[PDB]
Ligand binder design. Structure first.
Ligand SMILES: CCCCCCCCCCCCCC(=O)SCCNC(=O)CCNC(=O)[C@H](O)C(C)(C)COP(=O)(O)OP(=O)(O)OC[C@H]1O[C@@H](n2cnc3c(N)ncnc32)[C@H](O)[C@@H]1OP(=O)(O)O
Ligand SMILES: CCSc1c(C(=O)N2CCOCC2)cnc2ccc(OCc3ccccc3)cc12
Ligand SMILES: [Mg+2]
Length: 411
């Protein structure tokens, strides 16, 4: 049933994942010297290409491939349209490895046909709390703790095959070449997410949406006006009032994050993230890169009242092309990114996220039920969607965990 995934070092069934007790590698250890030095073979009409993410033009070629051929729902309503500014941000964090950006082009016209990207991440991925308890009970602490140290691994994202080349087994060849390039840098694990079920997730969570511009959403969504608004005389007026937000933030002291905030944001975020079983560790340079505001891409506010930063939140922008509409070309979504609250309740911090996003002309705020996101779903009027984000590791055995034990946000 999986001609490619059956050949890879990943858990092969749900049952296998539910029986794993300790974190650790799937494969026995290899060295960089064991790994082929030459690119994986490809058909003579194609060639491997390493785009330069410094170069505006190479970013633009990747942007167009993804604009026309990236993730689209099963009803062909929406397709993500990550901006060029976003792809530069995502693809070039501190100490990124250019070789981990892997593309296929047609040899004749140099048309870009496929892409996949890896970036570095430092991840806590040792045995989860509930499994460490089971291990202490049985005198197996030392085994359970062996891979507790944060590991410098690869995060994979942006896998894409052009629509004309679908179902030709090109995605496996991109996955193999990316694995080769990562392994030749002495990295042996990756983390990735997908909205589809593959073998085999260690965690899965539903997506949640909070309408910010419900009229637009009703024009473009399959279901809007949501049917349960039909018992009213004016369904649309009741829908608008349901989702209405204040026009200005409520936390006194909220302001945009600035470079001097980096060390305090790093500290409050690290203290919060360290409570979860799977989560990143960020250097000051990675806090600066992923959290300082960047126009049209990432938006980050701190609560500082008395010249001390006690709270912050961030969101990032992913527009989608709206495939079948007269009125609207684009859906402007704000996705909840990292946050930390030490002085106000999390729901009060995130309400100011919604207030800012709405003031800036976003249509919807999205998130997955990771972190403590479930804590404010009902009061802030998020609704579950149809989708699930599934979290995976490559070459890492890991017990099944709840998505409220995952602290890694995927872009
Ligand atoms: C140590 C370092 C390791 C680094 C590598 C770590 C692994 C990284 C893994 C990648 C994480 C990516 C994270 C993201 O970016 S998730 C976003 C994925 N992108 C899209 O959904 C964009 C639109 N769709 C497409 O571009 C294509 O349909 C793709 C490229 C998805 C498949 O192309 P195509 O439809 O033309 O099919 P094929 O004939 O070439 O290939 C068929 C094989 O592909 C398997 N498949 C289908 N979807 C996915 C998927 N989302 N992750 C992994 N595998 C996938 C499928 O099970 C089958 O294998 P098997 O069932 O027969 O065995
Ligand atoms: C985030 C999953 S839903 C989705 C949106 C989205 O934000 N929506 C659509 C429903 O109206 C408001 C919220 C926007 N553009 C998309 C583009 C592709 C797509 O493919 C399905 C998918 C399912 C799970 C995870 C990722 C993608 C879904 C969406
Ligand atoms: Mg293919």
């Amino acid at each position: 049933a999986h001609a490619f995934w059956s050949t890879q070092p990943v858990p092969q069934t749900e049952d296998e994942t539910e029986k794993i007790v300790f974190a650790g590698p799937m494969d026995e250890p290899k060295t960089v010297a064991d790994i082929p030095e030459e690119p994986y073979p490809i058909a003579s009409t194609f060639e491997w290409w390493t785009p330069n993410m410094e170069a505006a033009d190479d970013i633009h070629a990747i942007y167009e491939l993804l604009r026309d051929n990236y993730v689209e729902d099963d009803d062909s309503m929406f397709r993500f349209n990550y901006s060029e500014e976003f792809l530069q941000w995502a693809l070039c964090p501190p100490n990124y490895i250019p070789d981990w950006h892997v593309a296929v082009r047609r040899k004749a016209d140099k048309k870009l046909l496929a892409f996949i990207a890896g970036v570095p991440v430092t991840l806590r991925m040792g045995t989860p709390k509930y499994m460490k308890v089971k291990a202490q009970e049985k005198g197996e602490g030392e085994e359970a703790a062996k891979y507790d140290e944060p590991r410098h691994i690869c995060e994979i994202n942006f896998l894409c095959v052009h629509k004309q080349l679908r179902e030709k087994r090109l995605a496996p060849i991109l996955i193999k070449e990316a694995t080769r390039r990562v392994n030749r840098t002495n990295v042996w694990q990756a983390v990735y997410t997908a909205g589809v079920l593959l073998p085999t997730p260690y965690a899965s969570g539903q997506y949640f949406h909070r309408s910010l511009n419900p009229e637009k959403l009703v024009e473009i969504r399959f279901s809007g006006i949501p049917a349960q608004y039909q018992k009213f005389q004016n369904p649309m007026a009741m829908l608008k009032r349901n989702y209405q937000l204040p026009s200005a933030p409520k936390n006194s002291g909220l302001r945009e994050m600035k470079p001097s905030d980096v060390p305090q944001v790093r500290r409050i975020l690290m203290n919060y993230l360290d409570s979860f079983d799977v989560g990143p560790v960020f250097s000051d340079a990675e806090i600066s890169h992923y959290l300082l505001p960047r126009d049209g891409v990432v938006f980050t506010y701190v609560v500082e009242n008395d010249k001390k930063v006690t709270d912050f939140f961030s969101f990032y922008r992913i527009p989608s092309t709206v495939i079948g509409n007269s009125n609207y070309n684009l859906l402007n979504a704000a996705y909840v990114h990292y946050y930390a609250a030490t002085s106000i309740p999390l729901h009060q911090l995130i309400l100011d996220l919604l207030i800012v996003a709405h003031s800036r002309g976003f249509d919807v705020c999205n998130m997955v039920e990771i972190l403590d996101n479930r804590s404010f779903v009902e009061q802030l009027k998020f609704g579950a969607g149809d989708g699930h984000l599934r979290y995976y590791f490559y070459n890492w055995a890991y017990p099944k965990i709840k998505p409220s034990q995952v602290a890694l946000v995927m872009l």
